[PDB]
């Protein structure tokens, strides 16, 4: 039952609802002739919502805010982005001209800079080292250390034991290293292993590309990055 790359139009957004308050986005976006899907979450914070990453530009992220409001009809307050890829900061300054604040890392938002993408506007402290964690709202913000990209981080949502693994994770269909050229090979292993060992009781796994599943997730990135690196 979850929307598939296939049945989502380039432009529109999809809701799944995950867990009590807590819901995945899902939009698509053409790249050399082939369409790929990207996932962020939602979270509600009282009578307002936490959005974690764009929908992938600033088209579908004006449709996000649309079909969010729509469907759950509560104010975005706030969005982190998790890492400084246009699937996570295109969008932005959709975000920034609606009223939304933007958070990111300051890493996040130093390397954002330096690929002329959209800048979150606040930065995040605490999250600098690696097996950092704090909270934000309803979720908890971790940075397990470089994997996908230096910056990136990932999300728990301790009332659904929800994992938001973002583009550190891969789907299980996923059995080829994806977009590698900002990646920390060598120490996305360790950084998936920090993830482990802090969010063990995690009962949904999202990855920040395709479909969700439950920790095994995680040995499955690993398994594709170790054979990546030894290509
Ligand atoms: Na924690
Ligand atoms: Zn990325
Ligand atoms: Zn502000
Ligand atoms: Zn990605």
Known sequence: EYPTVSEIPVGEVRLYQIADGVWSHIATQSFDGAVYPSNGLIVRDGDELLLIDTAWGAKNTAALLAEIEKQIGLPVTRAVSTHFH?????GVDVLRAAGVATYASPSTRRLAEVEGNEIPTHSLEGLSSSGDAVRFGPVELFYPGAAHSTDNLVVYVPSASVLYGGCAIYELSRTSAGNVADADLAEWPTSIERIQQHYPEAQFV?????????LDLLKHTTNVVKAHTNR
């Open 86 to 90: 246009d699937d996570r900061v295109g």
């Open 206 to 214: 999202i990855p920040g590309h395709g479909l969700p599943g439950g």
